[PDB]
Symmetry: C2
């Protein structure tokens, strides 16, 4: 039963994530929705990194530095860390699986925290200026 948001929907909205954790012996369901909410927030950041990968690859890209896929995966933490105002928009438990999904939605992000995290992982000033500027496009595009 329900909810619409749990349907494969496949058009982006990059700042929204769904992801799940599973019921587990040690644990209250409140702990398991937390795990799921947290993985869903991480999914938003993964969505953002994927978009940045597309930008860097683009014929248009201005970033001069070499950024490897492993470096991009590395950007996931600081993007996450930079997320502001992420609301849990809904929880769904699959009764067959005991699998708990979460819909999360990031309202914005802290550019200066992101700039700082990116500099700590050995990006150029040029690269962070561009990366942070792409994330800003991402958030205004909602």
């Amino acid at each position: 039963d329900v909810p619409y948001w749990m349907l494969q929907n496949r058009s982006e909205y990059i700042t929204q994530g769904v992801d799940s954790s599973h019921i587990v012996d040690g644990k209250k369901t409140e702990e398991i929705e937390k795990i799921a909410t947290k993985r869903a927030t991480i999914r938003v950041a993964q969505n953002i990194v994927h978009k940045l990968k597309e930008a860097y690859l683009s014929k248009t890209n201005r970033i001069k530095q070499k950024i490897t896929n492993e470096m991009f995966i590395q950007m996931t933490q600081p993007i996450y860390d930079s997320l502001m105002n992420v609301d849990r928009l809904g929880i769904y438990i699959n009764p067959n699986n005991e699998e708990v999904f979460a819909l999360v939605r990031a309202r914005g992000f802290d550019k200066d925290a992101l700039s700082e995290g990116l500099h700590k992982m050995s990006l150029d000033n040029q690269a962070v200026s561009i990366l942070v500027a792409k994330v800003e496009e991402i958030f205004k595009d909602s």
Copy 2:
């Protein structure tokens, strides 16, 4: 009501796709499941191109040529064209939306058709050897 496959599930299987088309004035639902099945197959190929993007970006990448995101998007057609044995595994119509989803699953792909399509879009021999070899990894990984 049902089906499991229509749940946000989020772990890959790269050779499976879900996508949808919508009911439309001109048209029998058989035409609209066809549209959906066809977009789902295209989704498999999009899934494959995304994986190739990750490989090329990797510190490990052997491909010497410059491949732009626009070029990668260009690889989508020949990958699709190369897909063999794609079964429609299920159809689901959202009654609220009149939205028809399709689950499709590509059993394999024709390496020589892929090699040919890739050469036609101005890839090196080196690039196609590597790209085709990554797709082979993708299909064996199922």
